[PDB]
């Protein structure tokens, strides 16, 4: 159940672990490219917000699903912020989204008055006007229903074949984590010089009980030097001060 690009869907991924284990290496994908984190490290990180955008586009439109890349699909249907963190995943889908006479179940917005801002999902069907006469719901001349289906066919050129695109968008550890790659825990060690990882904030120091309180949504703090001052332990939620090793 992939969406028309003009009305791309989105699902939230939360309160779960792993499956960032370079799944793309199964080579079922025509392309896989990350704009933030290098793919092999995704499975070592924790995230606070993970979402998957799901839609079908033509092969020559795959190149438009990128930060900084303009064009009608990029501007009228699905748009990424240029400051994008996430990975764009895509594959050929002729076995599902193509028909001999054309698979017309997927709509594109071709006619629009203005460009989208990041992640705006405009599902409006207002007839588009392109001229001095109002053409109010007429269809023809200066106005058209904004959406057009494309007849995907198994025999068309590759750029005209359907591709399924999933964009995995995410935030980094600037809040308590909800989604993590697979990790093996070890016990909390207090005092002594210890190398720690938690949800990230990797470093070495001496962990002692803190006399601090954090607001419920803060997870960790920062010093004037922008280094972690203290962290909350993901398990049991004690606040630990990180002092330097002598």
């Amino acid at each position, epitope marked *: 159940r992939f969406a028309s690009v003009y009305a791309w869907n989105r699902k939230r991924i939360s309160n779960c672990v792993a499956d960032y284990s370079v799944l793309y290496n199964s080579a079922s994908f025509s392309t896989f490219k990350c704009y933030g984190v290098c793919p092999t490290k995704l499975n070592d990180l924790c995230f606070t917000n993970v979402y998957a955008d799901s839609f079908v586009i033509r092969g020559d439109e795959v190149r438009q699903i990128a930060p900084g890349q303009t064009g009608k699909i990029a501007d009228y249907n699905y748009k990424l912020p240029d400051d994008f963190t996430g990975c764009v995943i895509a594959w050929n889908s002729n076995n599902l989204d193509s028909k001999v006479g054309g698979n017309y179940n997927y709509l594109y917005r071709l006619f629009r008055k203005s460009n989208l801002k990041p992640f705006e999902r405009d599902i409006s069907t207002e007839i588009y006007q392109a001229g001095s*006469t109002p053409c109010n719901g007429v269809e023809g001349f200066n106005c058209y229903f904004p959406l057009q289906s494309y007849g995907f066919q198994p025999t068309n050129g590759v750029g005209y074949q359907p591709y399924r695109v999933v964009v995995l968008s995410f935030e980094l550890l600037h809040a308590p984590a909800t989604v993590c790659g697979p990790k093996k825990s070890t016990n909390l060690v207090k005092n002594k010089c210890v190398n720690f990882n938690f949800n990230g904030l990797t470093g070495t120091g001496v962990l002692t009980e803190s006399n601090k309180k954090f607001l419920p949504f803060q997870q960790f703090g920062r010093d004037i030097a922008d280094t972690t001052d203290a962290v909350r332990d993901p398990q049991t939620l004690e606040i630990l001060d990180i002092t330097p090793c002598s």
Partner: antibody, heavy 122, light 103 residues
Framework: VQLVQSGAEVKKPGSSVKVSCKAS????????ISWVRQAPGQGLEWMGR????????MYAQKFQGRVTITADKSTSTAYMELSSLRSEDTAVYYC??????????????????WGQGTLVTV | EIVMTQSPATLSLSPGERATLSCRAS??????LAWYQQKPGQAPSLLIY???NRATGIPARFSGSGSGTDFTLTISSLEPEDFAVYYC?????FGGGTKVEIK
């Protein structure tokens, strides 16, 4: 670019008139084709316009239901069908090119090249 | 459709005289008019598009004017070969037409 149409025909009442105009060169990817009827003793009566690019056809209210337009995907082939031919509906009818377009979809405001036509009767 | 009325039903003038042909809409069409010249045995050809803007291949004697609902076709000097029936067309359909005859 071109408006190469069919020859003339005579047929049984109720039968469909199925003819097409073929436009070569760059017509397919640009300009659309409009069908108009030169009824005798009258002015021209526009019937409809086909746009193979947008998968759309525009129609005169006068000819809705009876006129439908089909087209191919290579040579722009404006395959107009007039259902239910009546003997009183005897006319020379033809295709014309709508020479104005844009990528901003102002599309077709007017005509340029007209093909004159062929006669259909009973 | 867009309903247009033309006037006179028949215009009567001598060759060399100016011919003025009227077309009036029930609704505004901005500048979207075309004018055409019909002859016995010939479907009318394009003279003007965009109300006043002369069509390619058409002699300078033809021009138009008007906007909104009120339009005119002017032939500055009608030639003996121009005693045609003239028509207006809106984005969609044609008006009634004016026959032009020699006085």
């Amino acid at each position: 670019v071109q408006l190469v149409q069919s020859g003339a025909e005579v047929k049984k009442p109720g039968s469909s008139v199925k003819v097409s105009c073929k436009a070569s060169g760059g017509t397919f990817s640009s300009y659309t084709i409009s069908w108009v009827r030169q009824a005798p003793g009258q002015g021209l009566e526009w019937m409809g316009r086909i746009i193979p690019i947008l998968d759309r056809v525009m129609y005169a209210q006068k000819f809705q239901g009876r006129v439908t337009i089909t087209a191919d995907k290579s040579t722009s082939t404006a395959y107009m069908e007039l259902s239910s031919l009546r003997s009183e509906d005897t006319a020379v009818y033809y295709c014309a090119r709508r020479a104005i377009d844009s990528d901003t979809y102002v599309e077709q405001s007017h005509f340029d090249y007209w093909g004159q036509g062929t006669l259909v009767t009973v | 459709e867009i309903v247009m009325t033309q006037s006179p039903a028949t215009l009567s003038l001598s060759p060399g005289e100016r011919a003025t042909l009227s077309c009036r809409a029930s609704q505004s069409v901005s500048s979207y008019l075309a004018w055409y010249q019909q002859k016995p045995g010939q479907a009318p050809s394009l003279l003007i598009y965009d109300a006043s803007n002369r069509a390619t291949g058409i002699p300078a004697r033809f021009s138009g004017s008007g906007s909104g609902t009120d339009f005119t076709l002017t032939i500055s000097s009608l030639e003996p070969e121009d005693f045609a029936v003239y028509y207006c067309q809106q984005p969609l359909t044609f008006g009634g037409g004016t026959k032009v005859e020699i006085k």
